[PDB]
């Protein structure tokens, strides 16, 4: 339990490059230098923006042990923490970045088989989080990391009382209710990000006005490459009654069915001439970057 | 089968730094750039020093497929090949280097648990090679790679069908006989390298006079940290009768027995101030550098 979260000394790692910033911190590419060793191992470091107090560190530590205990091929694990004045958090570095930036930069080379398989994998990780009784609260394409193009992992979940309005279920906006079923709403938006190759949802609509447009029944529009079979799934994720939305276990089955005939369900120009994963190219990736079970 | 060996294009990888050179080639730290991707993935590249011909490449390819088919936590797998005029071979890059360079650099900080556990692991991979009926032919501390300080893997085996005199069994020197039993002889020298923290075997004896001294019954001397129990095992690996030498399956059992009470079997000054990593440090290493099953 507590051996899954490594407490690091300031001196055994170094921030070398800024990767980005979000709501609660700045993420750096870093190097871990093990004590007494000569190697430098790349890591990702998130330094929190606000300074905390030794008793606030007790709250952080309690949740951090939980996030270090996940064990699933499609869920990132928190690896370590350094309790400086501003707390720093360490996880595995993903050289491919987040899935949002990935679908934007490769939006002219991504076939339906990849897109559908990413949907399957994100649903697998969320179903695991539900089994562990962990609500994500901030599912979005930026919080799905690409370990390899064939293997994505959910990250930055579990942050309970520590706002991404345009990804949140109506009841989360109005009442601060976060459940596994509002994660299903955020899943639909995340899929919409992938199918639009990374468009901003509700572009140009002020966040303070989103719950008004949701209450009047407007939802994100049908992405051009999405058939209606895919679009109904996304829309069912945005039902006002949370208990009527699909469950993650069901979303696994439906997108796995569609992934077995991906060109029937996504309509992409050039899809027949698009890279798909050969066993040779997959064996190479896993041996170089991705040795974990799946 | 042949999906286990990736055939690479010249343009998808680059040599960036020379790591060392041996009998048949020069090893580089390199980078793989996947087609259509932006990331740069570190690899190790061995360029053979003599250029080959398309028909000689068929021989190389037949063997490269066999070396790409090993699956054991303690045996490195060949990952890819590029058929340039001088052939280039690609495998995982080990930032810790080979065990010979590592034991030399940490010779004042290596405890008995590590050394005995390295002997076990080297024996596990060799026993696997024997189960696969693959003769190593060039086992030596330089051909054991450190994936993490806790996990070593044997490399550069199998150049059979197709000289390190001081690691070779007498029958291999005199008769070019290489068997699993002569690998056991090379294992004995390898353990001697580790227990002397990387001393050169038979230092000051010309290689051309080695078969003379072995026939006369001379062997490597007992390293200062080895009890008679450990040295007796090494000596049994250097018996002239190949079938009287221990089997790798036996060497696993015996060195595991010693690793469960390591200070009784190795006498290292300061050993009580150096032990294995806690579970915390093993979990951290494995998540960052070493996700494979064991
Ligand atoms: O480290 C993460 N991302 C990374 N990117 C790159 C490198 S690390 C993810 C993350 C990584 C995972 F691998 C898995 C899950 C996960 O959530 N975390 C973990 C985490 C734990 C705790 C906190 C936390 C809790 C409480 C408080 N305060 C102020 C308000 N009131 C109470 C006291 C401040 C901060 C934040 C995070 C977080 O952002
Ligand atoms: O590449 C290896 N090391 C590495 N270091 C860093 C990067 S790659 C290991 C290696 C790596 C492993 F991961 C596992 C086993 C293994 O052996 N190989 C593999 C290999 C295959 C073939 C050959 C080969 C075969 C025949 C010939 N002929 C042609 C006919 N006329 C003249 C000579 C020349 C060369 C050599 C090797 C070799 O050295
Ligand atoms: N483990 C990681 N490896 C590589 N890049 C990462 C990693 N974690 C996060 N990033 C990148 O770091 C940047 C900022 O991450 P983060 O601060 O979590 O912001 P965000 O996810 O964009 N926003 P937020 O919704 O608040 O979590 C993003 O571009 C991520 O792609
Ligand atoms: N995968 C690897 N990762 C990192 N370093 C490596 C790797 N493979 C080999 N090396 C290093 O590269 C150098 C040369 O490798 P190599 O050409 O096989 O020579 P060698 O094994 O030392 N001698 P030989 O018995 O002739 O093969 C050595 O210093 C090794 O430590
Ligand atoms: Mg994030
Ligand atoms: Mg070698």
XYZ file of C-alpha atoms and ligand atoms in Angstrom:
730
model
C 0.000 0.000 0.000
C 2.456 2.722 1.119
C 5.336 1.095 -0.792
C 3.522 1.948 -4.058
C 4.163 5.677 -3.427
C 7.799 6.662 -3.408
C 8.750 9.670 -1.276
C 11.498 11.481 -3.168
C 14.183 13.868 -2.020
C 14.556 17.198 -3.795
C 18.095 16.226 -4.722
C 17.284 12.987 -6.582
C 15.384 14.603 -9.472
C 15.673 17.657 -11.696
C 13.104 19.522 -13.796
C 14.580 20.056 -17.253
C 11.731 21.176 -19.528
C 8.202 22.582 -19.295
C 5.618 20.391 -21.017
C 2.516 22.364 -20.135
C 0.320 23.783 -17.416
C -3.175 23.030 -16.244
C -5.681 24.006 -13.581
C -3.617 22.918 -10.576
C 0.016 22.797 -11.667
C 2.757 22.883 -14.256
C 4.055 19.662 -15.752
C 7.770 19.339 -16.516
C 9.836 16.678 -18.189
C 12.381 15.676 -15.553
C 15.213 13.311 -14.762
C 15.405 10.992 -11.803
C 18.973 10.385 -10.607
C 18.944 7.353 -8.279
C 21.089 7.733 -5.169
C 24.638 6.524 -5.802
C 23.988 5.766 -9.495
C 25.083 7.565 -12.658
C 22.013 7.244 -14.922
C 19.301 9.831 -15.560
C 15.815 8.382 -16.013
C 13.123 10.600 -17.617
C 10.010 11.294 -15.553
C 7.030 13.599 -15.673
C 6.769 16.032 -12.744
C 3.695 18.102 -11.833
C 4.536 20.964 -9.458
C 1.399 22.321 -7.768
C 0.868 26.082 -8.240
C -0.040 26.819 -4.669
C 2.170 26.248 -1.647
C 0.817 23.900 0.975
C 1.208 23.410 4.695
C 2.367 20.275 6.532
C -1.256 19.482 7.464
C -2.522 20.056 3.917
C 0.204 17.616 2.913
C -1.615 15.010 5.027
C -4.715 15.283 2.814
C -2.581 15.161 -0.335
C -0.723 12.093 0.940
C -3.964 10.223 1.722
C -5.236 10.577 -1.811
C -1.826 10.082 -3.367
C -1.588 6.598 -1.833
C -4.938 5.798 -3.472
C -3.801 7.006 -6.896
C -0.590 4.993 -6.509
C -2.608 1.776 -5.985
C -4.288 1.532 -9.400
C -3.270 -1.501 -11.498
C -4.780 -1.582 -14.965
C -3.203 -1.343 -18.432
C -5.315 1.721 -19.265
C -4.900 3.683 -16.038
C -1.800 5.674 -15.152
C -0.397 5.173 -11.648
C 1.017 7.929 -9.476
C 4.621 6.852 -8.773
C 6.065 9.359 -6.308
C 5.752 12.616 -4.472
C 8.212 15.207 -3.169
C 6.969 17.354 -0.295
C 8.598 20.689 -1.051
C 6.829 23.957 -0.160
C 5.012 23.536 -3.452
C 4.408 19.793 -3.744
C 5.761 17.924 -6.779
C 4.210 14.750 -8.158
C 6.035 12.159 -10.256
C 4.630 9.702 -12.809
C 5.869 7.911 -15.929
C 6.798 10.264 -18.779
C 4.816 9.715 -21.979
C 6.964 10.918 -24.922
C 3.872 10.827 -27.163
C 1.998 13.340 -24.987
C -1.696 13.598 -24.437
C -4.280 12.204 -26.848
C -5.753 15.680 -27.505
C -2.486 17.055 -28.904
C -1.890 13.738 -30.679
C -5.167 13.696 -32.627
C -4.693 17.380 -33.551
C -1.155 16.927 -34.917
C -1.959 13.703 -36.811
C -5.510 14.573 -37.880
C -4.696 13.667 -41.505
C -3.285 10.187 -40.801
C -5.634 8.614 -38.224
C -7.894 5.799 -39.395
C -11.092 4.514 -37.858
C -9.504 1.442 -36.267
C -7.273 3.603 -34.062
C -10.062 6.020 -33.157
C -12.442 3.234 -32.176
C -9.776 1.360 -30.226
C -8.923 4.485 -28.238
C -12.626 4.703 -27.323
C -12.516 1.064 -26.162
C -9.392 1.634 -24.084
C -10.638 4.816 -22.393
C -13.807 2.938 -21.480
C -11.763 0.042 -20.057
C -9.835 2.374 -17.777
C -12.984 4.176 -16.628
C -14.734 0.867 -15.912
C -11.700 -0.074 -13.797
C -11.924 3.253 -11.954
C -15.604 2.523 -11.308
C -14.785 -0.974 -9.979
C -12.285 0.702 -7.631
C -15.073 3.191 -6.715
C -12.989 6.125 -7.944
C -14.665 9.013 -9.700
C -12.426 10.723 -12.255
C -14.011 14.263 -12.190
C -11.829 15.570 -15.068
C -11.985 13.131 -17.963
C -11.010 14.912 -21.208
C -8.753 14.134 -24.161
C -5.975 16.122 -22.439
C -6.218 13.651 -19.533
C -5.776 10.593 -21.721
C -2.068 10.029 -22.360
C -0.547 8.222 -25.345
C 1.976 5.617 -24.209
C 2.189 4.336 -27.816
C -0.257 5.081 -30.671
C -1.842 1.695 -29.895
C -2.063 2.086 -26.088
C -3.656 5.000 -24.220
C -4.047 5.474 -20.469
C -6.327 7.610 -18.311
C -4.584 10.128 -16.023
C -5.245 12.901 -13.437
C -8.325 11.273 -11.844
C -9.447 11.180 -8.194
C -9.010 14.910 -7.369
C -12.189 15.215 -5.236
C -12.484 18.701 -3.685
C -9.341 20.020 -5.424
C -13.690 23.931 -13.396
C -13.889 22.134 -16.800
C -17.477 23.261 -17.366
C -17.636 22.194 -21.001
C -16.862 18.551 -20.087
C -19.122 18.268 -17.030
C -22.569 16.761 -16.671
C -25.402 19.210 -16.058
C -25.881 17.995 -12.475
C -22.180 18.564 -11.839
C -22.484 22.127 -13.135
C -25.652 22.905 -11.178
C -25.184 20.914 -7.971
C -21.526 19.767 -7.721
C -22.679 16.128 -8.010
C -19.824 13.919 -9.241
C -20.575 10.234 -9.784
C -19.489 7.508 -12.179
C -22.465 8.524 -14.292
C -21.217 12.087 -14.726
C -17.897 10.565 -15.779
C -19.935 8.922 -18.561
C -20.985 12.408 -19.677
C -17.341 13.529 -19.731
C -16.517 10.369 -21.669
C -18.908 11.401 -24.441
C -17.270 14.817 -24.718
C -13.858 13.099 -24.768
C -14.965 10.877 -27.638
C -16.296 14.009 -29.401
C -12.823 15.537 -29.094
C -11.280 12.481 -30.788
C -13.845 12.236 -33.607
C -13.443 15.949 -34.363
C -9.650 15.493 -34.224
C -9.434 17.808 -31.248
C -11.969 20.591 -31.767
C -12.823 22.731 -28.772
C -16.320 21.836 -27.502
C -18.850 24.693 -27.398
C -16.303 26.908 -29.147
C -17.017 30.581 -28.451
C -19.757 29.933 -25.860
C -18.886 31.426 -22.439
C -18.609 28.730 -19.777
C -21.015 30.634 -17.506
C -23.785 30.004 -20.061
C -23.279 26.274 -20.743
C -25.836 24.933 -18.266
C -28.496 27.210 -19.868
C -27.860 25.747 -23.324
C -27.823 22.203 -21.905
C -31.128 22.717 -20.088
C -32.698 23.902 -23.356
C -31.590 20.587 -24.903
C -28.750 21.617 -27.200
C -25.778 19.252 -27.348
C -22.526 18.973 -29.230
C -23.148 18.525 -32.975
C -22.578 15.379 -35.005
C -18.883 15.141 -36.002
C -18.589 14.737 -39.794
C -16.711 11.381 -39.716
C -19.180 9.884 -37.196
C -22.021 7.755 -38.429
C -25.291 8.076 -36.576
C -24.564 4.792 -34.718
C -21.603 6.516 -33.084
C -23.504 9.762 -32.590
C -26.337 8.072 -30.680
C -23.829 6.708 -28.171
C -22.391 10.172 -27.516
C -25.891 11.639 -27.181
C -26.933 8.903 -24.744
C -23.907 9.975 -22.674
C -25.497 13.424 -22.439
C -28.940 12.487 -21.159
C -30.171 14.706 -18.335
C -31.163 11.672 -16.256
C -27.779 10.341 -15.151
C -29.119 6.824 -14.523
C -30.279 6.553 -18.141
C -26.810 7.145 -19.544
C -24.875 4.053 -20.633
C -22.573 2.336 -18.166
C -18.869 2.029 -18.924
C -19.139 -1.773 -19.091
C -21.723 -1.315 -21.846
C -19.576 1.272 -23.636
C -16.741 -1.310 -23.796
C -19.001 -3.839 -25.532
C -20.495 -1.389 -28.020
C -17.241 0.230 -29.171
C -15.542 -3.193 -29.259
C -18.307 -4.379 -31.577
C -17.764 -1.344 -33.805
C -13.982 -1.720 -33.724
C -14.386 -5.131 -35.362
C -15.834 -3.370 -38.432
C -14.521 0.171 -38.047
C -15.179 1.468 -41.551
C -18.891 0.693 -41.105
C -19.102 3.113 -38.158
C -16.622 5.883 -39.014
C -16.509 7.532 -42.432
C -12.989 8.860 -42.979
C -11.524 10.030 -46.277
C -8.523 7.859 -47.125
C -9.348 5.314 -44.411
C -8.380 2.414 -46.683
C -4.855 3.786 -47.187
C -4.243 4.604 -43.510
C -1.671 3.024 -41.174
C -3.104 0.145 -39.093
C -0.991 -1.766 -36.450
C 0.953 -4.753 -37.942
C 2.040 -7.485 -35.443
C 5.674 -6.633 -36.301
C 5.263 -2.930 -35.546
C 3.330 -3.652 -32.347
C 5.942 -6.129 -31.050
C 8.658 -3.513 -31.595
C 6.746 -0.739 -29.756
C 6.000 -2.925 -26.752
C 9.576 -4.157 -26.476
C 10.897 -0.575 -26.625
C 8.246 1.395 -24.732
C 5.494 -0.770 -23.420
C 6.469 -3.987 -21.664
C 3.517 -4.061 -19.253
C 0.907 -6.771 -19.680
C -1.427 -4.959 -22.058
C 7.452 -15.798 -35.559
C 8.956 -13.457 -38.146
C 6.691 -10.728 -36.768
C 9.126 -10.715 -33.844
C 11.915 -9.127 -35.906
C 11.254 -5.656 -37.242
C 12.938 -4.840 -40.547
C 13.871 -1.171 -40.278
C 14.496 1.533 -42.854
C 17.722 3.528 -42.720
C 15.689 6.693 -42.361
C 13.794 5.704 -39.197
C 16.814 5.531 -36.910
C 20.068 7.401 -36.256
C 23.284 6.552 -34.449
C 24.053 9.294 -31.950
C 26.831 7.987 -29.666
C 29.373 5.129 -29.554
C 29.060 2.953 -26.452
C 31.729 0.356 -27.140
C 33.004 -2.170 -29.643
C 33.666 -5.885 -29.526
C 34.571 -8.876 -31.663
C 32.050 -8.452 -34.470
C 30.841 -4.874 -34.211
C 30.503 -1.467 -32.567
C 27.544 -0.594 -30.333
C 25.867 2.834 -30.401
C 23.229 4.586 -28.390
C 20.667 5.480 -31.036
C 17.200 6.854 -31.674
C 14.231 5.266 -33.432
C 11.879 7.792 -35.102
C 8.586 6.048 -35.942
C 7.203 6.813 -39.408
C 4.715 9.665 -39.312
C 5.494 10.322 -35.640
C 7.433 13.091 -33.941
C 8.985 11.253 -30.978
C 12.549 9.955 -30.621
C 12.938 6.626 -28.831
C 16.355 5.556 -27.487
C 17.753 2.263 -28.779
C 21.026 0.380 -28.906
C 22.459 -0.260 -32.370
C 25.271 -2.713 -33.205
C 26.882 -2.154 -36.597
C 28.818 -5.182 -37.785
C 32.348 -4.189 -38.661
C 32.597 -6.159 -41.916
C 30.199 -5.491 -44.768
C 28.067 -8.355 -45.950
C 26.439 -9.492 -49.169
C 22.755 -10.147 -49.871
C 23.277 -13.928 -49.662
C 25.265 -13.669 -46.444
C 22.359 -11.575 -45.104
C 20.081 -14.606 -45.445
C 22.275 -16.447 -42.900
C 22.227 -13.454 -40.588
C 18.438 -13.196 -40.968
C 17.871 -16.876 -40.177
C 19.762 -16.440 -36.905
C 18.308 -12.998 -36.157
C 14.821 -14.547 -36.155
C 15.918 -17.100 -33.555
C 17.436 -14.399 -31.312
C 14.201 -12.400 -31.664
C 12.153 -15.357 -30.361
C 13.529 -15.578 -26.778
C 11.026 -14.730 -24.021
C 12.523 -14.791 -20.536
C 12.983 -11.971 -18.005
C 16.764 -12.660 -17.928
C 17.513 -12.923 -21.645
C 17.621 -9.996 -24.017
C 15.646 -10.308 -27.237
C 16.825 -8.979 -30.570
C 14.231 -6.431 -31.645
C 15.118 -5.319 -35.172
C 17.629 -5.248 -37.996
C 18.611 -2.931 -40.848
C 20.223 -4.512 -43.888
C 22.657 -1.779 -44.856
C 26.040 -2.734 -46.366
C 27.243 -3.224 -42.802
C 24.243 -4.696 -41.007
C 22.782 -2.868 -38.028
C 20.985 -4.682 -35.215
C 18.610 -3.006 -32.768
C 17.719 -3.983 -29.221
C 16.532 -2.208 -26.088
C 18.984 0.366 -24.728
C 20.157 -0.343 -21.167
C 21.140 2.996 -19.570
C 22.984 1.159 -16.743
C 25.331 -0.512 -19.200
C 26.814 -3.951 -18.823
C 27.356 -5.694 -15.504
C 31.154 -5.583 -15.912
C 31.219 -1.782 -16.112
C 28.692 -1.566 -13.287
C 30.555 -3.824 -10.813
C 33.737 -1.893 -11.535
C 32.100 1.440 -10.832
C 30.330 0.342 -7.642
C 33.001 -1.964 -6.241
C 32.884 -0.159 -2.872
C 29.076 -0.224 -2.624
C 27.857 -3.652 -3.773
C 26.429 -5.868 -1.074
C 26.175 -9.632 -0.928
C 22.467 -9.756 -1.739
C 23.021 -8.110 -5.140
C 25.980 -10.278 -6.212
C 24.268 -13.523 -5.250
C 21.024 -12.387 -6.899
C 22.914 -11.547 -10.112
C 24.374 -15.075 -10.100
C 20.867 -16.497 -9.779
C 19.478 -14.378 -12.617
C 22.359 -15.127 -14.983
C 21.797 -18.810 -14.218
C 18.061 -18.425 -14.914
C 18.616 -16.975 -18.365
C 21.290 -19.531 -19.192
C 19.024 -22.384 -18.119
C 16.347 -20.892 -20.399
C 18.823 -20.789 -23.268
C 19.553 -24.443 -22.541
C 15.818 -25.301 -22.512
C 15.649 -23.601 -25.948
C 18.801 -25.547 -27.015
C 20.597 -22.297 -27.787
C 24.266 -22.213 -26.896
C 25.531 -18.840 -25.792
C 29.230 -19.135 -26.879
C 30.279 -15.752 -25.447
C 28.996 -15.483 -21.882
C 31.020 -12.962 -19.840
C 30.195 -10.080 -17.502
C 30.431 -7.732 -20.476
C 27.507 -9.692 -22.037
C 25.224 -9.397 -19.029
C 23.286 -6.128 -19.225
C 21.940 -4.210 -16.230
C 18.328 -3.255 -16.811
C 18.065 -2.029 -13.213
C 20.508 -2.758 -10.377
C 17.984 -5.493 -9.402
C 17.526 -7.049 -12.845
C 20.229 -8.252 -15.215
C 19.755 -9.854 -18.616
C 22.038 -11.950 -20.747
C 22.853 -10.710 -24.257
C 24.867 -11.546 -27.410
C 24.272 -15.335 -27.407
C 23.626 -17.696 -30.309
C 26.390 -16.923 -32.790
C 26.752 -20.706 -33.528
C 25.957 -21.875 -37.072
C 27.591 -18.517 -38.057
C 37.927 -15.343 -29.619
C 37.305 -14.854 -25.891
C 39.946 -17.408 -24.889
C 39.904 -16.535 -21.223
C 36.192 -17.350 -20.867
C 36.182 -20.551 -22.949
C 36.078 -24.135 -21.803
C 39.208 -26.146 -22.524
C 37.349 -28.351 -25.022
C 36.170 -25.201 -26.829
C 39.732 -23.869 -27.087
C 41.177 -27.204 -28.306
C 38.284 -28.668 -30.297
C 35.860 -25.773 -31.120
C 33.233 -27.695 -29.131
C 30.631 -25.256 -27.718
C 27.867 -26.816 -25.633
C 25.686 -25.893 -22.724
C 28.408 -27.504 -20.598
C 31.094 -25.177 -21.953
C 28.707 -22.264 -21.291
C 28.753 -23.451 -17.687
C 32.514 -22.942 -17.760
C 32.022 -19.382 -19.082
C 29.442 -18.837 -16.339
C 32.064 -19.736 -13.749
C 34.440 -17.098 -15.090
C 31.538 -14.599 -15.155
C 30.807 -15.176 -11.478
C 34.537 -14.722 -10.892
C 34.363 -11.370 -12.653
C 31.472 -10.251 -10.421
C 33.013 -11.446 -7.155
C 36.294 -9.708 -7.947
C 34.339 -6.587 -8.926
C 35.514 -6.857 -12.516
C 39.125 -8.032 -12.375
C 40.595 -9.254 -15.643
C 40.823 -13.065 -15.583
C 44.317 -14.549 -15.829
C 45.777 -11.051 -15.878
C 49.257 -11.132 -17.447
C 48.943 -14.575 -19.111
C 48.963 -14.429 -22.941
C 45.800 -15.882 -24.431
C 47.996 -18.274 -26.500
C 49.244 -19.883 -23.266
C 45.836 -20.373 -21.580
C 45.199 -23.919 -22.805
C 48.687 -24.791 -21.480
C 47.914 -23.631 -17.942
C 44.427 -25.156 -17.811
C 45.701 -28.577 -18.852
C 48.263 -28.228 -16.070
C 45.392 -27.795 -13.650
C 45.664 -24.067 -12.962
C 42.430 -22.152 -12.404
C 41.342 -18.685 -11.394
C 42.123 -17.964 -7.726
C 39.568 -17.672 -4.966
C 38.291 -14.082 -4.817
C 38.816 -12.494 -1.392
C 35.063 -12.088 -0.629
C 34.162 -15.689 -1.544
C 33.802 -18.355 1.100
C 35.034 -21.828 0.256
C 31.390 -22.701 -0.490
C 31.212 -20.176 -3.305
C 34.680 -20.950 -4.659
C 33.936 -24.699 -4.700
C 31.054 -24.011 -7.094
C 33.209 -21.915 -9.454
C 35.873 -24.637 -9.475
C 33.293 -27.303 -10.349
C 32.405 -25.177 -13.420
C 36.031 -25.501 -14.588
C 36.422 -29.267 -14.342
C 37.978 -30.751 -17.440
C 35.147 -33.326 -17.800
C 32.263 -31.287 -19.195
C 29.583 -33.645 -17.876
C 30.952 -33.367 -14.307
C 30.313 -29.612 -14.276
C 27.098 -28.435 -12.605
C 23.964 -27.865 -14.625
C 22.379 -24.418 -14.791
C 19.235 -25.773 -13.127
C 21.450 -26.771 -10.170
C 23.261 -23.421 -10.117
C 19.872 -21.690 -9.790
C 18.972 -23.786 -6.740
C 22.352 -23.372 -5.060
C 22.790 -19.624 -5.539
C 19.161 -19.047 -4.463
C 19.934 -21.003 -1.293
C 22.918 -18.738 -0.648
C 20.956 -15.576 -1.479
C 18.544 -16.429 1.364
C 21.485 -16.160 3.810
C 23.918 -13.991 1.857
C 26.461 -12.917 4.524
C 27.204 -16.535 5.397
C 28.439 -17.063 1.845
C 30.109 -13.764 0.902
C 32.457 -11.810 3.186
C 32.178 -8.129 2.202
C 33.421 -5.283 4.383
C 30.522 -2.983 5.280
C 27.914 -5.457 4.012
C 25.569 -4.611 6.877
C 25.349 -1.027 5.547
C 24.264 -2.095 2.022
C 21.087 -4.127 1.318
C 18.576 -4.589 -1.548
C 16.064 -1.815 -2.265
C 12.962 -1.660 -0.149
C 9.717 -2.666 -1.921
C 9.235 1.072 -2.477
C 12.376 1.454 -4.554
C 11.683 -1.715 -6.579
C 8.153 -0.566 -7.400
C 9.493 2.813 -8.535
C 12.225 1.350 -10.764
C 9.859 -1.170 -12.310
C 7.233 1.450 -13.144
C 9.777 3.778 -14.775
C 12.217 1.351 -16.456
C 11.164 -2.236 -16.059
C 7.504 -3.160 -16.511
C 8.045 -6.706 -17.814
C 6.683 -9.642 -15.816
C 9.805 -10.265 -13.757
O 0.123 13.644 -10.617
C -0.786 13.732 -11.463
N -0.438 14.101 -12.808
C 0.842 14.327 -13.287
N 1.223 14.683 -14.506
C 2.634 14.780 -14.663
C 3.379 14.482 -13.550
S 2.279 14.050 -12.278
C -2.190 13.407 -10.894
C -2.480 11.919 -11.025
C -1.496 11.087 -11.552
C -1.780 9.756 -11.675
F -0.759 8.950 -12.239
C -2.937 9.118 -11.337
C -3.931 9.943 -10.824
C -3.712 11.306 -10.672
O -4.679 12.110 -10.175
N -2.433 13.958 -9.547
C -2.408 13.191 -8.294
C -2.749 14.173 -7.142
C -2.855 13.959 -5.756
C -3.193 15.020 -4.897
C -3.443 16.333 -5.360
C -3.819 17.437 -4.343
C -4.762 17.170 -3.296
C -5.151 18.153 -2.334
C -4.610 19.488 -2.354
N -4.989 20.563 -1.307
C -5.636 21.876 -1.679
C -7.197 21.876 -1.657
N -7.828 21.163 -0.501
C -7.069 19.988 0.026
C -5.531 20.169 0.035
C -3.692 19.725 -3.399
C -3.311 18.751 -4.351
C -3.327 16.530 -6.773
C -2.979 15.456 -7.663
C -2.773 15.294 -9.192
O -2.867 16.131 -10.086
O 22.687 -7.742 -31.724
C 23.206 -8.128 -30.683
N 23.586 -7.167 -29.699
C 23.400 -5.767 -29.768
N 23.960 -4.806 -29.034
C 23.531 -3.509 -29.380
C 22.623 -3.428 -30.385
S 22.280 -5.040 -30.929
C 23.348 -9.640 -30.666
C 22.191 -10.254 -29.910
C 21.220 -9.411 -29.371
C 20.208 -9.997 -28.674
F 19.252 -9.108 -28.132
C 20.019 -11.331 -28.429
C 21.000 -12.188 -28.957
C 22.058 -11.649 -29.685
O 23.030 -12.430 -30.215
N 23.546 -10.173 -32.003
C 22.474 -10.774 -32.861
C 23.155 -11.205 -34.150
C 22.638 -11.833 -35.289
C 23.483 -12.120 -36.358
C 24.845 -11.787 -36.359
C 25.737 -12.177 -37.539
C 25.558 -13.466 -38.107
C 26.343 -13.957 -39.170
C 27.401 -13.169 -39.727
N 28.244 -13.687 -40.861
C 27.750 -13.631 -42.272
C 28.446 -14.665 -43.157
N 29.887 -14.380 -43.319
C 30.526 -13.588 -42.214
C 29.762 -13.497 -40.850
C 27.587 -11.900 -39.134
C 26.792 -11.432 -38.069
C 25.344 -11.169 -35.192
C 24.513 -10.870 -34.092
C 24.711 -10.199 -32.720
O 25.719 -9.732 -32.188
N 2.926 11.930 -17.795
C 2.992 12.863 -18.734
N 3.890 12.722 -19.734
C 3.947 13.666 -20.679
N 3.228 14.777 -20.805
C 2.348 14.881 -19.800
C 2.171 14.001 -18.760
N 1.163 14.448 -17.919
C 0.758 15.571 -18.457
N 1.444 15.885 -19.597
C 1.256 17.035 -20.446
O 1.422 18.180 -19.651
C 0.525 19.228 -20.083
C -0.147 19.818 -18.873
O -0.674 18.758 -18.059
P -1.685 19.206 -16.918
O -1.038 20.248 -16.081
O -2.271 18.003 -16.275
O -2.801 19.941 -17.784
P -4.106 19.469 -18.552
O -4.216 17.987 -18.376
O -3.905 20.010 -19.933
N -5.239 20.290 -17.741
P -6.133 19.769 -16.495
O -7.498 19.473 -16.990
O -6.235 20.840 -15.481
O -5.593 18.543 -15.812
C -0.409 18.606 -21.127
O -0.079 19.057 -22.434
C -0.155 17.103 -21.012
O -0.153 16.513 -22.289
N 21.766 -3.030 -25.237
C 22.816 -2.337 -24.799
N 22.592 -1.221 -24.068
C 23.640 -0.534 -23.607
N 24.939 -0.781 -23.777
C 25.131 -1.896 -24.495
C 24.154 -2.719 -25.019
N 24.724 -3.785 -25.706
C 26.012 -3.581 -25.580
N 26.331 -2.476 -24.833
C 27.661 -1.974 -24.530
O 28.315 -1.782 -25.762
C 29.703 -2.155 -25.660
C 30.094 -3.048 -26.817
O 29.183 -4.159 -27.048
P 29.737 -5.453 -27.892
O 30.064 -5.106 -29.286
O 28.787 -6.651 -27.811
O 31.157 -5.762 -27.154
P 31.415 -6.778 -26.002
O 30.260 -7.622 -25.604
O 31.878 -5.965 -24.774
N 32.660 -7.800 -26.476
P 32.202 -9.200 -27.323
O 32.359 -10.463 -26.387
O 33.111 -9.319 -28.496
O 30.711 -9.117 -27.866
C 29.931 -2.711 -24.255
O 30.599 -1.744 -23.453
C 28.521 -2.932 -23.698
O 28.543 -2.517 -22.329
Mg -4.246 16.643 -16.830
Mg 28.427 -8.191 -26.166
